Amino acid sequence: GSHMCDAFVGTWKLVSSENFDDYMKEVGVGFATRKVAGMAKPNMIISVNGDVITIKSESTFKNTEISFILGQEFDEVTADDRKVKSTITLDGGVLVHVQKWDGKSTTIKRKREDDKLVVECVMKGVTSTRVYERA
Ligand SMILES: O=C(O)[C@@H]1CCCC[C@@H]1COc1ccc(Cl)c(Cl)c1
């Protein structure tokens, strides 16, 4: 086993969101995509197989899937169709995901807190908090 497996692996459902529209504005997402994406209630499926972590997000808006090794950069196409270079590390028990594109950067942190998986998305001064619980 591993810390990663015990903390994050499973199937999670979105239960609350704060400031996600404002986060998406700051990222540069256009009006129509913000409206449809902001309505979504994704499930987050996290798995581990050896060194490879997979995070899948399934919703009525888009389905995404990333697979990666901690510390090792990869190319990602986000739900809003940005082509980013991503690096994900596990720092003090928090998954830290940095996306770089067009000279810009956003950081997504995933944390266990009580029975929740808390996602914090930061773009310059703007944070969105999205709370997931086990399905
Ligand atoms: O949907 C979620 O809770 C997940 C949470 C984890 C980070 C990824 C995503 C949030 O990030 C998004 C999702 C959709 C769009 Cl359109 C943009 Cl700009 C970002």
Curated annotation (Swiss-Prot):
SUPFAM superfamilies: Lipocalins. This is Fatty acid-binding protein, adipocyte. It comes from Homo sapiens (Human). Belongs to the calycin superfamily. Fatty-acid binding protein (FABP) family. A motif (Nuclear localization signal) lies at residues 25-35. One of its GO terms (cellular component) is extracellular exosome. The gene is FABP4. PROSITE patterns: FABP (PS00214). The lineage of its organism: Eukaryota, Metazoa, Chordata, Craniata, Vertebrata. GO terms for biological process: brown fat cell differentiation; cellular response to lithium ion; cellular response to tumor necrosis factor; cholesterol homeostasis; fatty acid transport; long-chain fatty acid transport; negative regulation of DNA-templated transcription; positive regulation of cold-induced thermogenesis.
